[PDB]
Amino acid sequence: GPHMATGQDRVVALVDMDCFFVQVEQRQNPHLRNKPCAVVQYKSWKGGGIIAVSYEARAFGVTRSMWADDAKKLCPDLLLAQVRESRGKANLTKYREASVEVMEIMSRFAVIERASIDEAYVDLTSAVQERLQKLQGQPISADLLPSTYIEGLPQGPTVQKEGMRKQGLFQWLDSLQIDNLTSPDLQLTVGAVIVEEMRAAIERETGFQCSAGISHNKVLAKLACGLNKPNRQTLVSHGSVPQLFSQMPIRKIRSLGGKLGASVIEILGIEYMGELTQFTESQLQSHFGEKNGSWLYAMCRGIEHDPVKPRQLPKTIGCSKNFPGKTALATREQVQWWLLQLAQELEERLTKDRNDNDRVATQLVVSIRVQGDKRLSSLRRCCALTRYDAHKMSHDAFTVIKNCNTSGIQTEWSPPLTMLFLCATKFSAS
DNA sequence: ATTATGACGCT
DNA sequence: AGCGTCATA
Ligand SMILES: [Ca+2]
Ligand SMILES: [Mg+2]
Numbered sequence: 001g002p003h004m005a006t007g008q009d010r011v012v013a014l015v016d017m018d019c020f021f022v023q024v025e026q027r028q029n030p031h032l033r034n035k036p037c038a039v040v041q042y043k044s045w046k047g048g049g050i051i052a053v054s055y056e057a058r059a060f061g062v063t064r065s066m067w068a069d070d071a072k073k074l075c076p077d078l079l080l081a082q083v084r085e086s087r088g089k090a091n092l093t094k095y096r097e098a099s100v101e102v103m104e105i106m107s108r109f110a111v112i113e114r115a116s117i118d119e120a121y122v123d124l125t126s127a128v129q130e131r132l133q134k135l136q137g138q139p140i141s142a143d144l145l146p147s148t149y150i151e152g153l154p155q156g157p158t159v160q161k162e163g164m165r166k167q168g169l170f171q172w173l174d175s176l177q178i179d180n181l182t183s184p185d186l187q188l189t190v191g192a193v194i195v196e197e198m199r200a201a202i203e204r205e206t207g208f209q210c211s212a213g214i215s216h217n218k219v220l221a222k223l224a225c226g227l228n229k230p231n232r233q234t235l236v237s238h239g240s241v242p243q244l245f246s247q248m249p250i251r252k253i254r255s256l257g258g259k260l261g262a263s264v265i266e267i268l269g270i271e272y273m274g275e276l277t278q279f280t281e282s283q284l285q286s287h288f289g290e291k292n293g294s295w296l297y298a299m300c301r302g303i304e305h306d307p308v309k310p311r312q313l314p315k316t317i318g319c320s321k322n323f324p325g326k327t328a329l330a331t332r333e334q335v336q337w338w339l340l341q342l343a344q345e346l347e348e349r350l351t352k353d354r355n356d357n358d359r360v361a362t363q364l365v366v367s368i369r370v371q372g373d374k375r376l377s378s379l380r381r382c383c384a385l386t387r388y389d390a391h392k393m394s395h396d397a398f399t400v401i402k403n404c405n406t407s408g409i410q411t412e413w414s415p416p417l418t419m420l421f422l423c424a425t426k427f428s429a430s
Numbered sequence: 431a432t433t434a435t436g437a438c439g440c441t
Numbered sequence: 442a443g444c445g446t447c448a449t450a
Binding site for chain 3: 016017019020021022039051052064083092095115116117118119254255256257258259260375376377379380381382
């Protein structure tokens with residue numbers, strides 16, 4: 001009744017750069033702009049592996065994870081940009097630096113949580129209150145929301161995309177109660193005005209475009225963001241939830257895309273998020289555990305309480321390289337040489353991190369995969385990280401893994417190694 | 431022979 | 442701690 005929480009206490013946005021690595025390359029090379037293009041890493045094996053795809057290329061069916069040779073079969077005029085190679089491996093520095101550009105702009109508007117290289121959650125609750133005070137009961141013009149979609153509208157009693165967008169928006173604004181500074185729908189609307197402003201600033205100052213979701217929590221924000229891409233933003237209101245979830249496959253919800261989501265579907269015999277409402281919280285907790293059960297019970301009603309964490313910097317800095325099929329490392333000299341390459345990239349990134357961010361990593365995590373193991377990682381071991389020195393780190397890493405060598409010969413490595421990983425963690429202020 | 435990342439949960 | 446899950450370019 002009057003005591004039933006509705007999860008409308010916050011305004012949260014998720015901003016996500018459109019085909020990010022592609023835009024980075026297109027900014028640098030104007031010849032790639034407005035073309036079907038992709039970003040690829042390496043090149044020898046089947047033309048390279050695609051990691052990002054422009055919307056023009058996606059129309060031909062080009063996807064992430066596709067080999068470039070195969071992509072060219074779908075899209076013969078596909079243009080490509082290659083990821084930089086340093087010390088024998090892919091080097092993502094250019095994209096990490098572009099990311100900082102965007103995050104520093106978003107941080108001017110609100111506290112952000114860096115969710116990935118190209119997305120951040122924004123807690124707009126306080127900013128919306130402020131903006132609402134400046135507004136003085138004054139209505140919000142459709143003009144302040146030029147790229148906004150209202151999920152669920154238009155409805156009820158134009159055949160062009162942009163025209164539908166506007167019809168929906170008009171219905172929404174026609175129905176807003178603006179004299180009420182606590183209306184959740186109004187709050188979301190003002191949130192969308194601010195995100196329009198954030199997105200304009202990002203584009204003006206970087207050249208990069210993005211999409212965004214505006215809702216009452218991170219999960220709905222994230223879902224909303226993907227509803228209208230690219231270069232658009234979507235408002236998912238509390239009210240839109242029942243209809244949106246009634247046909248929303250469970251795997252679409254963040255955290256439900258893997259094994260848990262599959263078990264929810266299998267155990268409960270349902271397909272869609274909204275079907276979850278028919279189970280009690282205790283039923284859900286019985287199948288999926290106490291925490292997941294409570295989470296699912298609230299989430300299928302559009303309610304979620306995870307905070308936007310005040311964190312703009314990554315918590316770890318890592319370097320990894322796969323050594324697939326025949327290239328697997330089978331000698332001690334090999335393993336040592338590659339540990340050094342990885343350690344050298346890591347030292348470089350750690351030193352920059354210390355100068356920029358006033359912190360020092362204190363733990364080195366070492367991880368390898370051995371040929372045969374189905375798991376991505378076969379073994380993880382940590383040691384102390386007392387000095388930013390690549391020779392030291394690679395030596396320490398070899399020490400912690402050197403006994404994974406089954407070989408009776410000192411110089412041979414069996415089973416061969418198909419992945420090496422160095423990660424610096426546990427930062428302290430400096 | 432996707433690859434290179436990065437966060438957080440479990441015991 | 443070391444392992445597994447889930448996610449993104
Ligand atoms: Ca993106
Ligand atoms: Mg993303």
